[PDB]
Write a protein that binds this ligand. Structure first.
Ligand SMILES: [Zn+2]
Ligand SMILES: [Zn+2]
Lengths: 460, 306, 359
């Protein structure tokens, strides 16, 4: 509901005021301590074109006059007394599109800025571009760029950015154009972000989905505790980057507690929690954990983290502590490393290696037989010669190597085939003066080189 | 050992298989001033040159020639950085790896003795019998490697008035504490005025400013009390090519476009590229152009100029 | 698992988006092996279009460029994983492999752009330390003097300075057995290679393995314009250069662009069948010509992972395949088609329910 209307009153003894500057109308409105708004219109022949709204604060009591570029308000002091009748001081609130007015005698710039505001309200920004060329105040360029955001024109907006020498925002716009050429809404969002207006990025492509970019924006505003709770319910594909970014944020804050717990929460404790402990020279505490009320939280999770067990096993293995490595590998059930260690030791503990290799062959056979028997129901009527094979066990490789070092090459060939080492299989098969095993292993390799050379190997 | 103006280097455990002691310098034209010894480096400063030798083989590795002469030398405990006073009563920090001398700004030659901190390798102190001042050397800022005395805030050149407390005899520096060998023989401890409150993470202006002036920026981020301090820390973190801290500070400062720009360059370690990107962000396009030009990615000034 | 299911059931839009998110997560969380795998298969996915849409040649080029870029990123990240692990994690390594890995990383980080979370500082520190340890003193000095123009973490420069000053005392004599050999120019590589890991002498890119990064005896030659890849395969199936190779090294040539060898029909007739390798870049359904390589020293066993089309040493690739993830880069497993038996995922979820219902 309005209360009063006001035209732009020209200044006393100032007859050089522009024509369009005479036609701007300001209205004081309040919604149904009430909100206050001041709304601006251009009283054109075609009707009333709305320019902009302007909310007023609690101390801003009302509007008394308009004199461009200022609403003249008989307000009270922010810390003053509204009950006081004597605290009625005038405030010249700037027009929203009259920012950066360094000179109060700036006449041509003010007139061309008013013309630009009129043309922006009309909208067809092609000559609104020329409305500001006379102006060298960069605030006019910023307002033009905001208009370019609201409209959706970017070739003007690139010049709008690059004439203010905002090389950060121009770089962002160029990268958005280069990487996302099909989508223009993302480039508009990048431009809006470079213009220090941030609520628009979600509103741009809210439900048509761009959850990753708004997650990055939510992080970039320092609102981690908003981004993580947004992504937990709404964007499940990027919980780990939010946790990792918060962990890096805490590490740069020199708070190893939260940094370590969030590097745990990001499922990157295989490489990053040991990084922090090793680069803080806190390796004694890590050894203590691997082999205090707040330490309960750490010790609840740390000793049984399978990735941590595996990393500590590798660490002690390369620290020339073979037996502690074996202990931690068995605690982490990494079959391949255990078999490698056992086949590497002097003496090579061959029987336990064979037992673990055959246990994994047993599990692989179980999976292959389960899938084959599951598939054979429809293969009862459908005759299929699907010569599927169980997943070969890589850990068997070392075992064959042991027989490869013991002259039991006939035994080694079986484990090489069980490992999938077709090249090592034919390497073994050479010395038997055998060719059929060579040929069928080459076929089973299913790689062109393995028959491509064994062809003329057989021809000689 | 220094006798007759020459230094003999000899093994301690006299064994027949041990080699003969050697004598330095090789040319007697230059009078020796000071020496220092590390586990692997033998450093001696004449009035002309500072020379370093590898103890395992005794070959010259670094030889920085002081054109303005040498009056005194003070080598860092690792025998790589030498704070040396020439004949002109000015102090120069010398990195012997790059053989680069930097003028110690703010150096008053009243304090003629220099002691490196035994914990932090980027802090030393200049003292006389009366008082001491603190110097921090940054290995890489946007202005290259620098060395500046710690100054009082709201004081660009001078430091605070110092009515000298009597009797104190500074002897050694460690973590901002000066071990002073008293005449009585006991070792008093004097905390540095530039290292007070630097171990509290509560909001306090003094803590932030002291850790700010010592290039302990990441620590100083815990003691921020006002956004003015925050933006100062952001500018300084960009200044010394610390991208990660720049992102960390700017996350509070609500400048998301800058944060998303910095996150693309937080990984590059070449110094020229970081200098160019940081100068462009700060707005120094001209310097950024030549920084990119002498870099390994020259085609970035082109995209900048477009 | 969702990505694998999308890979099985076409629908390239959602597979594209999910693979972007996964590769980005691997890069930002520094899971460089995961990022290398995601990018090398993302390049292959960039040739996948819906059957309802037939792209223009413009879109085919706009996706071929991204396929090649993602192959390059995958190579860089896979190479950089071990170097970053050595720099940060307290784990030893293989000396020669890490040395050649850092050498290749230098050859690929010189003028081309740098992928995210790849640091030149780690590469230079690693190469310097290993070259010092492996008595590669000249290269150690070169990397050390280059290191001053690269910043480092706040707790590294002490040992860096000590090693820079210490290596100056050591004599400058590099061993020739640890130096890369460019077989095209038939000359060793003593200097640091330029961008693209090309030869210092004849600008030839190094045909390297991707486990230990050793320059395999392979030279790259492109067919002449009157021959095509189909015609090349036809003439390979159906059927001096000593004078020619000398003219290649003649002075005055433009030294800002690589000049590959040119293949004619008669030289392909004279070529032995085992001495030619054909690389078909698996970018998807996009048309990309097949590259051709010549092998002259048969004493070294080379192979090519069909899922990845990268060169490896055959025994080294076989040994690395035993880690339970196929090829170390693309995780390709032979003996089965591209579309696996995805019922394995259903049994895995069955086993997960079983482990939940154990107690
Ligand atoms: Zn060459
Ligand atoms: Zn592969």
């Amino acid at each position: 509901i309005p209360n009063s209307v006001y035209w732009n009153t020209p200044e006393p003894n100032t007859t050089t005021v522009g024509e369009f500057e005479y036609i701007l109308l300001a209205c004081e409105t309040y919604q149904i301590q009430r909100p206050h708004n001041i709304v601006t219109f251009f009283a054109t022949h075609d009707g009333l074109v709305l320019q902009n709204f302007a909310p007023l604060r609690r101390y801003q009591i009302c509007l008394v006059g308009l004199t461009i570029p200022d609403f003249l308000l008989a307000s009270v002091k922010i810390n003053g007394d509204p009950n006081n009748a004597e605290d009625y001081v005038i405030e010249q609130k700037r027009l929203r599109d009259f920012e950066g007015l360094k000179s109060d005698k700036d006449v041509a710039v003010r007139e061309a800025l008013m013309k630009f505001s009129y043309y922006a309200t009309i909208g067809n920004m092609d000559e609104a571009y020329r409305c500001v060329k006379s102006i060298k105040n960069p605030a006019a360029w910023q307002g033009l760029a905001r208009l370019c955001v609201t409209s959706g024109r970017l070739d003007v907006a690139a010049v709008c950015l690059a004439t203010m020498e905002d090389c950060v925002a121009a770089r962002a716009l160029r990268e958005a154009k280069e990487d996302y050429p099909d989508d223009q809404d993302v480039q508009l969002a990048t431009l809006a972000l470079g213009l220090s207006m941030t609520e628009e990025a979600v509103e741009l492509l809210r439900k048509s989905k761009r959850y990753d970019l708004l997650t990055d924006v939510y992080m970039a505003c320092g609102k981690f505790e908003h981004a993580q709770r947004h992504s937990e319910r709404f964007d499940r594909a990027r919980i780990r980057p939010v946790a990792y970014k918060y962990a890096q944020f805490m590490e740069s804050l020199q708070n190893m507690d939260a940094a370590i717990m969030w590097y745990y929460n990001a499922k990157c404790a295989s490489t990053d929690v040991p990084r922090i402990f090793f680069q803080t020279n806190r390796m004694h505490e890590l050894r203590q954990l691997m082999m205090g009320e707040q330490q309960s939280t750490f010790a609840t999770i740390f000793p049984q983290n399978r990735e941590l067990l595996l990393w500590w096993a590798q660490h002690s293995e390369r620290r020339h502590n073979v037996q502690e490595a074996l202990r931690f590998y068995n605690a982490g059930e990494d079959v391949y490393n255990i078999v490698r260690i056992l086949c590497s030791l002097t003496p090579p503990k061959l029987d336990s290696a064979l037992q673990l290799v055959n246990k994994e062959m047993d599990k692989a056979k179980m999976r292959f037989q389960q899938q084959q028997a599951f598939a054979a129901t429809a293969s009862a009527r459908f005759g299929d010669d699907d010569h599927g094979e169980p997943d070969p066990v890589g850990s068997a490789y070392f075992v064959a190597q042991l027989y490869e070092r013991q002259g039991d090459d006939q035994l080694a060939l079986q484990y090489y085939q069980a490992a999938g080492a077709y090249r090592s299989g034919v390497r073994v098969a050479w010395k038997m003066e055998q060719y059929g095993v060579v040929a069928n292993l080459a076929m089973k390799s299913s790689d062109e080189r393995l028959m491509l050379e064994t062809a003329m190997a057989l021809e000689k | 050992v220094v006798y007759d103006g020459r230094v003999q280097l000899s093994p301690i455990r006299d064994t027949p298989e041990a080699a003969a002691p050697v004598y330095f310098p090789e040319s007697g034209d230059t009078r020796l001033v000071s020496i220092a010894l590390s586990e692997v480096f033998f450093l001696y400063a004449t009035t002309s040159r500072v020379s370093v030798y590898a103890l395992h083989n005794l070959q010259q590795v670094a030889t920085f020639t002081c054109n303005t002469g040498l009056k005194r030398a003070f080598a860092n405990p690792a025998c790589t950085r030498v704070a040396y006073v020439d004949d002109s009563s000015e102090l120069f920090n010398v990195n012997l790896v790059t053989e680069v001398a930097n003028k110690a700004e703010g150096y008053d030659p009243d304090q003629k003795m220099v002691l490196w901190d035994q914990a932090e390798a980027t802090v030393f102190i200049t003292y006389d019998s009366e008082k001491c001042a603190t110097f921090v050397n940054t290995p890489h800022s946007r202005h290259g490697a620098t060395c500046e005395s710690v100054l009082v805030k709201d004081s660009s050149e001078d430091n605070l008035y110092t009515p000298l407390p009597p009797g104190y005899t500074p002897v050694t520096l460690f973590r901002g504490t000066v071990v002073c060998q008293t005449p009585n023989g006991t070792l008093e401890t004097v905390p540095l005025q530039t290292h007070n409150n630097i171990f509290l993470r509560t909001p306090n202006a003094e803590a932030f400013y002291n850790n700010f002036s010592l290039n302990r920026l990441r620590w100083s981020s815990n003691n921020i009390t006002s956004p003015q301090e925050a933006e100062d820390l952001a500018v300084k973190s960009l200044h010394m090519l610390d991208v990660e801290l720049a992102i960390r500070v700017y996350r509070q400062l609500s400048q998301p476009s800058l944060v998303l720009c910095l996150e693309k360059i937080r990984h590059i370690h070449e110094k020229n590229l970081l200098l160019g990107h940081v100068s462009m962000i700060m707005g120094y396009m001209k310097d950024a152009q030549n920084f990119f030009l002498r870099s390994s990615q020259p085609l970035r000034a082109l995209e900048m100029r477009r | 698992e969702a990505l694998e299911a999308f890979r099985a059931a076409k629908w390239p839009k959602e597979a594209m988006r999910l693979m972007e998110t996964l590769a980005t997560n691997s890069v930002t969380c520094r899971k460089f092996r995961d990022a290398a795998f995601y990018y090398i298969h993302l390049a292959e996915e960039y040739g996948r279009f819906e059957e309802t849409e037939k792209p223009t040649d413009v879109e085919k080029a706009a996706r071929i460029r991204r396929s090649k870029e993602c192959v390059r990123r995958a190579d860089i990240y896979y190479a950089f994983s071990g170097v970053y692990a050595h720099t940060t994690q307290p784990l030893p390594y293989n000396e020669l492999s890490l040395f050649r890995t850092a050498k290749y990383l230098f050859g690929m980080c010189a003028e081309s752009a740098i992928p995210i979370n790849v640091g030149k500082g780690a590469i230079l520190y690693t190469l310097s330390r290993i070259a010092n340890r492996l008595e590669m003193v000249r290269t150690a000095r070169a990397v050390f003097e280059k290191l001053q123009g690269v910043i480092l973490p706040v707790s590294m420069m002490e040992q860096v300075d000590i090693e820079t000053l210490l290596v100056r005392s050591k004599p400058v004599k590099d061993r020739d057995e640890l130096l890369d050999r460019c077989f095209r120019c038939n000359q060793l590589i003593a200097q640091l290679p330029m961008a693209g890991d090309r030869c210092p002498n004849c600008f030839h890119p190094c045909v390297r393995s991707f486990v230990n990064f050793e320059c395999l005896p392979l030279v790259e030659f492109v067919l002449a314009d009157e021959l095509t890849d189909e015609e090349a395969e036809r003439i390979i199936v159906s059927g001096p250069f000593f004078t020619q190779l000398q003219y290649v090294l003649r002075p005055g040539r433009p030294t800002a662009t690589y000049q590959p060898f040119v293949a004619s029909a008669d030289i392909l007739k004279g070529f032995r069948r085992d001495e030619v390798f054909i690389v078909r870049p698996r970018y998807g359904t996009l048309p990309v010509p097949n590259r051709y390589y010549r092998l002259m020293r048969s004493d070294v066993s080379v192979c090519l992972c069909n899922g990845c089309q990268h060169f490896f040493i055959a025994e080294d690739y076989e040994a690395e395949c035993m880690r339970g993830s196929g090829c170390p880069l693309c995780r390709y497993r032979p003996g089965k088609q591209v579309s696996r038996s995805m019922k394995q995922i259903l049994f895995d979820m069955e086993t997960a329910a079983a482990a939940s219902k154990t107690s």
